[PDB]
C-alpha cells in the first residue's frame, strides 16, 4: 500500500 508505505512490494 503506497497510502501507508514508501514503496510497494
Amino acid at each position, epitope marked *: *500500500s*503506497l*497510502l*501507508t*508505505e*514508501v*514503496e*510497494t*512490494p
Partner: antibody
Amino acid sequence: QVQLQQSGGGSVKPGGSLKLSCSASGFSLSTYAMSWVRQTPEKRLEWVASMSSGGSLYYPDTVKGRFTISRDTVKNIVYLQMSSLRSEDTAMYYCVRGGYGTSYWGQGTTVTVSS
Amino acid sequence: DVLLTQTPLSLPVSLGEQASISCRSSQSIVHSIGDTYLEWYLQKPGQSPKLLIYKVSNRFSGVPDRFSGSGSGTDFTLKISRVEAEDLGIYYCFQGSHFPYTFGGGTKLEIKR
C-alpha cells in the same frame, strides 16, 4: 509536523485540462510515497495516482494516459496534471503522504467538470 | 480489480454500544505470501479521511484500542467498542495489495441520542 495543502481546483470544461498542486511542509517529499485520492459527489473514494519515494509511477486504467503525477523536491510540491477531463472526474482531490505505517491526507481541492 | 463490498450502508448506534462494519473482498488478498494490506479510514463531517487501521489489524498511532480490525479469507471487520459522539462519519475499507487500489463504498455511522 506535517502539512499538506492542495490548490488549483475549480471549474473546467469537459475535454479541458487542469493542474493540481500539493504543497508540503514539515517533511522531505522524497522520503515518502505521495498519492492522489478523490471523493466523488456520491462519496466514493477512488485512488487516482501514486509516486513512490523512489519515483515509480502508478495509475489506474480509468485515468491512465490522462493524468500525470510528478514532484518538485526543490519547492516541495506534488502535482497532478489532468487532461481530457470528463464528468466522472468531478470530485474533491486529496493529496496523501504514505510511509512507515502512516497516512496523512490534506484538506482537498474541489474539481468540477462542467460547462 | 479487487472489489470490496462494504455493509451496512448506514449504521445507527447508541453511545457506549458496539458497532460492527464488514468488508467483503472478491478474492483472497494476500500480496504473494507476504502481508495483507487492508486498511480502514474514517471521514468525519467536514474533514478529510484519516487512517484507523493498517494491515488488517494494526492501529495507527493515536487511535484508541476500542477500534479493532480483524478478518480472514474474504471477510474483514472493523469493530468499534464503545462508541462516542466523535466516532460519527463515513468509514471506508481499502485494499493496497493489488493494483488498482480500491475502496469499499462506505458506511455512515449515525449516533442515536
